[PDB]
Design a protein around this ligand. Structure first.
Ligand SMILES: CC1=N/C(=C\c2cc(F)c(O)c(F)c2)C(=O)N1C
Ligand SMILES: [Ca+2]
Length: 126
């Protein structure tokens, strides 16, 4: 069924990521249900350069195993990440996405900031 993956989400997940620059991150995603198919997300964590992660976004069912994710990170100059989480097990999801925007928060979009940058990761049920 289309909501089988969504039904697992409500609550807190441990999240680890890797970006295209070679950095890693650790933190949490918290899902708040808004319907059988949609969730609100808040995000916290730290990048391997020490920078804090603060974000909020939304999840929407796409297939029985996947959900579309859009997250904005105020702690990272309001960069926008868009991607999909794919169910791997009842307690694990895989993350594949890309982001762009004023990551360094200086108010100007540099070349590194102008195009999409890859983001991969894993979510583990806590
Ligand atoms: C661990 C974690 N990293 C997140 C985002 C994130 C991680 C990164 F390594 C980035 O370069 C970046 F632009 C965003 C997130 O929301 N969580 C929970
Ligand atoms: Ca910038």
């Amino acid at each position: 069924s289309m909501s089988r993956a969504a039904q697992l989400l409500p609550g807190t997940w441990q999240v680890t990521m890797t970006n295209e620059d070679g950095q890693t991150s650790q933190g949490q995603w918290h899902f708040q249900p808004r319907s059988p198919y949609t969730m609100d997300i808040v995000a916290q964590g730290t990048i391997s350069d020490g920078r804090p992660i603060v974000g909020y976004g939304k999840a929407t069912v796409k297939t029985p195993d996947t959900l579309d994710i859009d997250i904005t990170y105020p702690s990272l100059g309001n960069i926008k990440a868009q991607g999909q989480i794919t169910m791997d097990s009842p307690t694990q999801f895989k993350w594949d996405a890309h982001y762009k925007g004023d990551k360094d928060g200086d108010g100007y979009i540099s070349a590194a900031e102008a195009a999409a940058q890859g983001l991969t990761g894993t979510l583990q049920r806590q």
